[PDB]
Design a protein around this ligand. Structure first.
Ligand SMILES: CCN1C[C@]2(COC(=O)c3ccccc3N3C(=O)C[C@H](C)C3=O)CC[C@H](OC)[C@@]34[C@@H]5C[C@H]6[C@H](OC)[C@@H]5[C@](O)(C[C@@H]6OC)[C@@](O)([C@@H](OC)[C@H]23)[C@@H]14
Ligand SMILES: CCN1C[C@]2(COC(=O)c3ccccc3N3C(=O)C[C@H](C)C3=O)CC[C@H](OC)[C@@]34[C@@H]5C[C@H]6[C@H](OC)[C@@H]5[C@](O)(C[C@@H]6OC)[C@@](O)([C@@H](OC)[C@H]23)[C@@H]14
Ligand SMILES: CCN1C[C@]2(COC(=O)c3ccccc3N3C(=O)C[C@H](C)C3=O)CC[C@H](OC)[C@@]34[C@@H]5C[C@H]6[C@H](OC)[C@@H]5[C@](O)(C[C@@H]6OC)[C@@](O)([C@@H](OC)[C@H]23)[C@@H]14
Ligand SMILES: CCN1C[C@]2(COC(=O)c3ccccc3N3C(=O)C[C@H](C)C3=O)CC[C@H](OC)[C@@]34[C@@H]5C[C@H]6[C@H](OC)[C@@H]5[C@](O)(C[C@@H]6OC)[C@@](O)([C@@H](OC)[C@H]23)[C@@H]14
Ligand SMILES: CCN1C[C@]2(COC(=O)c3ccccc3N3C(=O)C[C@H](C)C3=O)CC[C@H](OC)[C@@]34[C@@H]5C[C@H]6[C@H](OC)[C@@H]5[C@](O)(C[C@@H]6OC)[C@@](O)([C@@H](OC)[C@H]23)[C@@H]14
Lengths: 211, 214, 210, 213, 210
């Protein structure tokens, strides 16, 4: 039985990653919707001598590919699987105001469901540009960082949020800084060069020293 | 004796050939074919406790054991070889993660597992971890207390079940001249429930109580 | 229709990349690279070591006949995205760095049907810079030269579109404000050598914000 | 000149015979044990940090072993008696500092010397941070620290460790270091765990040092 | 022209149709010429006795197996190629305290006579007591470079000059250079009859007087 459930899963992955191989990313003809959400774990550091703030968070990324669809009946009623993030295409979602390379804290493994949808949730430590003036007051400090594709326009990758509230439910209760509010908002930009719209998600965090 | 050693080498190379190079890559556990992973921790040192950022750095050994039927063999068919060492990259390993780490975990030991003929794998990486921890009280008699949870990043308890052999962290090789002394260290399996999800989620909670050595 | 356009792109790349990589330029077949810097932040000015850390976007453009194709032979595809590790890229180097350059963006280029490539890496650079005067009204001045490490001007020619560094996205709440930022193409000759060598000189004047 | 082409060809063929026309040595077993000889040479104590009780050491770790599968007859190969090869082309032992606090940083090219009798010589230069309380380093007695080295996964039934001498080589120790070495020993130890019938072997590096005046 | 096609053919011919050069032996020794160019002394830490240095290490050698006749290949006399496509010598700083950090592209120039020129830029931390750096005579520091595994019977070292090149030393460094020499030395070990060759880089420096 368990030998057969393995054989089914092994066959499924072969059928997907070895027939009509590596999806080449989205195009204007075949656009992609990526949904972004953030879960904030901890503000680790606020350096007022370089105006850098260090953040630990989960970035939840979701998208759907027809080329990852399968009928569970063709494959022993397998409805989802786990696979390495290097085995599939992933979107190039970038923090636009980072000051150091993003550091990856979690295994980089995705979950693929039979409808072709992919959930990928990397935990990261990010240093970005932020003046924490007022962090030692009641008002606190406010900082913003924008995330988006580095090379794809809104005509190839459409970004969405399900909610504009950052999930704070697992924020570390004994951090040096407390979160007054945290929002994530979709924005459309245009550039004078270019006709296409460009999408980002603006993460706005207001925070202050713990009392 | 030279031939006897060549024979034993040929059998080991043939064993590994038959397991790794001519039998499909194990795709991981499913709800249909679940896996039990046993965790235990050996604490070697608390290196640093930073109250300016609430980060603490530990050095520990993390013992991982699991068992796959697809790694079984009969010693009799392979010159009575009962186990072998292999690179951890040659086999599937569980995605056990420190959930509250603040920096990438740093591996201190070679990445090599021991595989036994019953299909059990023993893998013991030595790691330095920075994690979230408020060390207030560390310079008092009562000490500070810190907790870090370990578990799969992507699997539920229907795919990867975690166990412990004991709830006591092994402190028998804890460094005698550390800046901090350990008052207590426990490791407890926890069943977690998320309101999103019907499945159980498992983690092992490592709770360390410690203070400055006088 | 979506399956066909995928298959078109897949085959274009295979035709371009799986059938003899460009071995770089020669005197007989020189390459022109255009550079433009966008300065995002001056992160740190260390007066104990005379190192300054910048964050900037570096726009790199060039054109290869070996990356050309006719859109009509490939389902009207006019450009595509690809990993910078699928194509040759110029060896443009900051000549006065004190640490390995740190890459902040995904390393992906855009290739257009006319053979043009656009590659825009975001980088954090530590380079040699005496920040004396930074706490005064005149500010400090620092200069860093970029260019090819191994190719002369006869193989890789560097150009800028403009001599003005783009400051439109510079961080409003940086510790340092920018008084001026220029990027100037320069030609040099060494006594050893008859060939010209090109560099772009990034000159930044800055001071502590008030 | 031509004869240089031939000795090249000979060495190319020797490496090909050893590494591509033969399966990779799977490591030692209880049936086919291996002796690894270990020696330490000490360059510099870089840092003694009494805020974290970590000390930084730069040292050469000399490793020697011998494999039948790396043997050849020099007469068959243009009278070549040894060669150099990337360490990644051959099996190497998993010798580890047991009390490191950071990943070891390698300072030398990872290249070994193989001799026609099958002996391999591999001498990696490393910077190691390890657990060490430097109390007394500012005194005449100095501080004493110890670190154990050995296989991470093999028992003494598979890898026997040995030393040629119990004196650490201090002949190259940096003369202008912040710290002078009073003494440095390296001692083979046989260890027993109550879990396990097999003997386990480590080499215990004991270093006595103080601030130089 | 496709002096492009000529270059591509030459590289195929040298690399993938004449196996990877195995390195030198007693029967086929190799001379490496070494020369240093100092860009900056970045840091001198008297709490650990480490000094951090930024420099170019010019490496030159010559292999018969890299020779060709320019007339067989459209009069191509040289080319650039990745340092990972050819053998390079294992020249090491013997007294480093941290891994060397590479600042430049790893690309070599190969000439038709079989000569290779490779010039990596590096930041090196090495053992050095900077006592007297704040005095008139300054501090003196020495670091030896040489092969890690080859003897003088396999790799002979030489320099072209005993003067280190200071003509591009950073003029606003915290430290000025009083003198900088590079001298071939021979060492023996009592175990062993063979000579061992190194190049000793001796730098005398002091705090720049402001
Ligand atoms: C390829 C690199 N890429 C990175 C960029 C980076 O964008 C941002 O940093 C950004 C985006 C929205 C809002 C604020 C942004 N931003 C800043 O610009 C500074 C600060 C750190 C910040 O958050 C992503 C979006 C787009 O590419 C898909 C860019 C724009 C598309 C187009 C635009 O030309 C003007 C613009 C680019 O300049 C070059 C491109 O030329 C084809 C680009 O480098 C980025 O512009 C900021 C911008 C392009
Ligand atoms: C895929 C990433 N994964 C990481 C997570 C991370 O979990 C934790 O950090 C965690 C787990 C137990 C107890 C405390 C935890 N925790 C925190 O949440 C913050 C703090 C650092 C910490 O220790 C592992 C367990 C499970 O995945 C197998 C997660 C949960 C399963 C499920 C849950 O949805 C609410 C939850 C996820 O949010 C997303 C998933 O969606 C299908 C997940 O990202 C993590 O939740 C925190 C949580 C999931
Ligand atoms: C191969 C390494 N390469 C790095 C160099 C580095 O050049 C620079 O750093 C530089 C270039 C222009 C202006 C100022 C420069 N400069 C400095 O020289 C120091 C300071 C950091 C700085 O900005 C690139 C240009 C050329 O290579 C295409 C070089 C020159 C070509 C030629 C010149 O010989 C005198 C010179 C090289 O010395 C060796 C070469 O010998 C064939 C070279 O290493 C660099 O010289 C500075 C210089 C060569
Ligand atoms: C595979 C990982 N491995 C690392 C170990 C680590 O050993 C040491 O750190 C060590 C060895 C001798 C003396 C002191 C040691 N040591 C300490 O234990 C703390 C301190 C840092 C230190 O120096 C190497 C030796 C042996 O494996 C060949 C171990 C022992 C063999 C056996 C022993 O079980 C009790 C023991 C292991 O615990 C697990 C094993 O279970 C099959 C092991 O993880 C290490 O135990 C310390 C110990 C094993
Ligand atoms: C393989 C590693 N290798 C590194 C060595 C390292 O040498 C040096 O560090 C060195 C060389 C010349 C002068 C001073 C040196 N030196 C020091 O010894 C300390 C200080 C950092 C320094 O500059 C290179 C030269 C030779 O290998 C080609 C070595 C010598 C050849 C021979 C010598 O043994 C007696 C000696 C080795 O000890 C081991 C070898 O055993 C067969 C070696 O590890 C280095 O010895 C210091 C020495 C060998």
């Amino acid at each position: 039985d368990k030998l057969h459930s393995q054989a089914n899963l092994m066959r499924l992955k072969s059928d997907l990653f070895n027939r009509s191989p590596m999806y080449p990313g989205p195009t204007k003809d075949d656009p992609l919707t990526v949904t972004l959400g953030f879960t904030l774990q901890d503000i680790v550091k606020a350096d007022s001598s370089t105006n850098e703030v260090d953040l630990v968070y989960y970035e939840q990324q979701r998208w759907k590919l027809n080329s990852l669809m399968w009928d569970p009946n063709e494959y022993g009623n397998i409805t989802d699987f786990r696979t390495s993030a290097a085995d599939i295409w992933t979107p190039d979602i970038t923090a636009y105001s980072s000051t150091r390379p993003v550091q990856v804290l979690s295994p980089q493994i995705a979950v693929v469901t039979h409808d072709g949808s992919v959930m990928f949730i990397p935990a990261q430590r990010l240093s970005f540009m932020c003046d924490p003036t007022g962090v030692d007051s009641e008002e606190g400090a406010t900082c913003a960082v924008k995330f988006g594709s580095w090379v794809y326009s809104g005509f190839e990758i459409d970004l969405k949020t399900d909610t504009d509230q950052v999930d704070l439910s697992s924020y570390y209760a004994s951090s040096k800084y407390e979160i007054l509010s945290a929002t994530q908002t979709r924005q459309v930009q245009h550039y004078s060069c270019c006709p296409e719209p460009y999408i980002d998600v603006n993460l706005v965090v207001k925070f202050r020293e713990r009392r």
